[PDB]
Design a protein around this ligand. Structure first.
Ligand SMILES: CC[n+]1c(-c2ccccc2)c2cc(N)ccc2c2ccc(N)cc21
Lengths: 91, 459
C-alpha cells in the first residue's frame, strides 16, 4: 500500500543513448526493473534491471531521434512491486 | 532580429528569500587582504625611494593572472557538493593543490625570469631605475608564489558553507603589520633591508595563511586527502587537465584588467602629466570598492554550480538573476557615491600621494563604465561561475579590449574635455557585455530545460 520511486530526470542523451537519474532513497527489499520502449506502440518493451539506491543508471538507446517512453520499478518487502513511475522524453 | 536574447526579464517568482549573505564575508575577508597593501605602502614609506610597489604591482600580475586559473575550481568543488565525497571532490582539491603549488612554482620561476626591468622606451614613474632594492621585493616576495597559491586553493575549497577564511585572512594581516616593519628595519629580526623587507615580510604571511588550510581540517569532517598529490592516468591525468580548460579561459580572461593596466598607465604618457596621473586615484578607488561588489557573484558562483550537482536546474540559474540584480541594487545605488564624492580632506597622501590641487575629470568615468560593468562580470562569475562557460567567455573579453582599442587613442584625438573619452567604446566595449554574457544566461538558463528532462514527479 504505497506510491512510486518518485523523481523524473533524463538530463541528457548521448544522442544515441541516455542517462536516467531518478530517485531511490535506499532501495526497498532491493530493486529496479526499468521499462524500455518508444511510445509508438510497436517496437516491443524491453528491460534494464538494477540494484541499491540505483534507479540512477543509463540506457543503451540504440535507435535515433524517435520518442521513447520509459518507466521504472520498485520491489519490496513483498517480493512484488511498490509503484511504477514514467516519462517519455526522447532523443 | 529584435531580441535573440530570449526571455530576459524572467528570473522571478518569490526569490526575495535568496540568501547568498555568507557570500559577502567571502569578499570581506578579501578587503581583509586588500587592506594590508596600504599598511605597507604607508608602512614602508619609512623608506622614501621605496615607492616599492614598482614590483608588488607587477608581481601581483602573475598572481591575479594565475590566481584566475585557481579560482577556476570555485565550481568543480561546489558542483560536487551536489554529490558527496569531498574526498573525490577532495582528490581534485589535492590535484589542484598540486596545481596551486605547481603553477605556483612558475609564478615562482616566471618570477625569477621576471627581474629585468633593466629596460626602457618611454617616460618616468615607469622606466628610469638606479637604486633598486626592488631588486629584492622581486625575489623575496616572488619566492612565495607557490605557497600563496595553495593559500588561495584553500578558499578554492571554501566553496560550500565555510568562510573560515574571514577568520584567518584577517588575523593574517594582523600578523603582518607587526611583522612587516621588523624587516624594513627592526628588532632582533633580520633588521636591515626595507625596500623589499616590507615584502619578504608580506610573503612570510602567505605561508602563514598557507596553513590555515592545514589547520582547518578541524571544524568537522575532512577536506584532507593529501595522499601523494600525484597524477598519471593517460598521457596527462586530468581532474587537472580537466582543470586546464576552466583555467586557461580565466587568467587569460583575467588579462582583461591585465590590459586595463597598460591602457590606464599609457595615457599619463603624453603631455597629460598632472591630473591625468591623478586618474589613478579614482581608478584605484575603483578596485578598492569595486571588490565587495564584483566578488559577490565571484562568491555566488558557488550557490549556482553547487546547485547543479544538486540537480535544482535553474532553480539556481533563476537565482543567477536574483543574485545578478541584487548587488545590482548597489551597483547603481552606489555609483551615486562615485560620480558624486571625491578625494576630500579625508584623503591625505596614501595609496598614491596626489590629493590637494587636482580636478574631478575623474568622477566622469566613475559612472560611465562603473555600474555598466559592476555586474557585467558577476554575470561571468556565474557563467563560468555556473557552467564551464569561459571556453569563449575568454572571447567574452577579446572585445573588452579589441573593442576598447581605438577608445584608447580617442582621449588623445578628442572632441571635448574627453578624459573619459577613451572611456568610450571602453564603456561601450564594456557595455556590449550587457549582451554576449547575460546573452549566454538566457541561451543558458534556457539550457536547463534541455537538461531538466523530466519537469516534475509524483507523490
Ligand atoms: C600602489 C599604487 N599602484 C597600484 C595599486 C595598488 C593597490 C590598489 C590600487 C592600485 C597598482 C595596481 C595594479 N593592479 C597595477 C599597477 C599598479 C601600480 C603601478 C605603478 C605605480 N607606481 C603604482 C601602482
Amino acid at each position: 500500500v504505497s506510491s512510486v520511486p518518485t523523481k523524473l530526470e533524463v538530463v541528457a542523451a548521448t544522442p544515441t543513448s541516455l542517462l536516467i537519474s531518478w530517485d531511490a532513497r535506499g532501495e526497498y527489499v532491493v530493486y529496479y526493473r526499468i521499462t524500455y520502449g518508444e511510445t509508438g506502440g510497436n517496437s516491443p518493451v524491453q528491460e534494464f534491471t538494477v540494484p541499491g539506491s540505483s534507479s540512477t543508471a543509463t540506457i543503451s538507446g540504440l535507435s535515433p531521434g524517435v520518442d521513447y517512453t520509459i518507466t521504472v520499478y520498485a520491489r519490496s518487502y513483498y517480493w512484488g512491486w511498490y509503484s511504477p513511475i514514467s516519462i517519455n522524453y526522447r532523443t | 532580429l529584435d531580441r535573440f536574447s530570449f526571455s530576459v526579464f524572467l528570473k522571478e517568482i518569490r526569490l526575495l528569500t535568496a540568501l547568498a549573505l555568507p557570500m559577502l564575508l567571502a569578499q570581506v575577508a578579501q578587503v581583509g587582504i586588500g587592506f594590508v597593501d596600504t599598511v605597507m605602502a604607508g608602512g614602508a614609506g619609512k623608506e622614501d625611494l621605496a615607492a616599492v610597489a614598482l614590483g608588488s604591482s607587477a608581481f601581483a600580475t602573475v598572481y591575479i593572472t594565475f590566481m584566475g586559473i585557481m579560482a577556476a575550481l570555485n565550481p568543480m568543488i561546489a558542483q560536487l557538493y551536489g554529490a558527496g565525497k569531498t574526498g573525490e571532490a577532495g582528490e581534485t582539491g589535492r590535484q589542484g593543490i598540486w596545481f596551486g603549488l605547481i603553477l605556483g612554482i612558475f609564478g615562482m620561476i616566471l618570477m625569477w625570469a621576471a627581474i629585468t626591468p633593466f629596460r626602457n622606451w618611454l617616460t618616468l614613474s615607469d622606466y628610469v631605475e638606479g637604486t633598486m632594492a626592488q631588486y629584492m621585493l622581486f625575489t623575496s616576495l616572488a619566492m612565495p608564489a607557490a605557497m600563496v597559491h595553495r593559500a588561495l586553493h584553500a578558499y578554492a575549497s571554501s566553496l560550500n558553507r565555510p568562510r573560515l577564511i574571514m577568520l584567518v585572512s584577517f588575523a593574517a594581516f594582523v600578523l603582518n603589520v607587526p611583522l612587516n616593519y621588523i624587516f624594513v628595519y627592526g628588532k632582533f629580526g633580520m633588521p636591515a633591508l626595507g625596500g623589499a623587507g616590507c615584502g619578504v615580510a608580506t610573503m612570510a604571511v602567505f605561508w602563514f595563511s598557507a596553513l590555515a588550510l592545514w589547520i582547518y581540517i578541524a571544524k568537522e569532517k575532512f577536506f584532507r586527502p593529501f595522499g601523494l598529490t600525484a597524477k598519471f592516468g593517460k598521457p596527462d591525468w586530468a581532474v587537472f587537465k580537466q582543470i586546464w580548460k576552466i583555467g586557461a579561459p580565466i587568467g587569460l580572461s583575467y588579462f582583461l584588467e591585465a590590459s586595463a593596466f597598460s591602457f590606464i598607465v599609457f595615457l599619463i604618457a603624453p603631455f597629460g602629466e598632472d591630473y591625468v596621473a591623478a586618474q589613478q586615484v579614482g581608478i584605484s578607488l575603483s578596485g578598492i570598492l569595486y571588490m565587495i561588489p564584483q566578488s559577490v557573484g565571484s562568491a555566488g558562483t558557488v550557490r549556482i554550480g553547487f546547485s547543479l550537482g544538486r540537480r535544482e536546474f535553474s532553480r539556481a540559474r533563476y537565482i543567477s538573476g536574483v543574485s545578478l540584480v541584487s548587488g545590482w541594487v548597489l551597483a547603481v545605488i552606489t555609483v551615486l557615491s562615485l560620480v558624486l564624492f571625491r578625494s576630500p580632506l579625508a584623503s591625505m597622501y596614501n595609496d598614491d600621494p596626489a590629493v590637494l590641487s587636482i580636478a574631478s575629470t575623474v568622477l566622469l568615468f566613475a559612472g560611465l563604465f562603473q555600474p555598466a560593468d559592476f555586474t557585467q562580470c558577476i554575470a561571468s562569475y556565474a557563467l563560468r561561475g555556473y557552467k564551464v562557460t569561459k571556453v569563449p567567455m575568454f572571447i567574452h573579453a577579446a572585445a573588452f579590449w579589441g573593442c576598447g582599442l581605438l577608445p584608447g587613442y580617442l582621449l588623445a584625438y578628442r572632441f571635448d574635455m574627453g578624459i573619459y573619452g577613451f572611456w568610450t567604446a571602453l564603456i561601450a566595449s564594456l557595455t556590449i557585455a550587457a549582451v554576449a554574457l547575460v546573452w549566454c544566461l538566457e541561451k543558458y538558463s534556457m539550457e536547463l530545460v534541455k537538461s531538466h528532462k523530466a519537469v516534475s514527479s509524483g507523490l
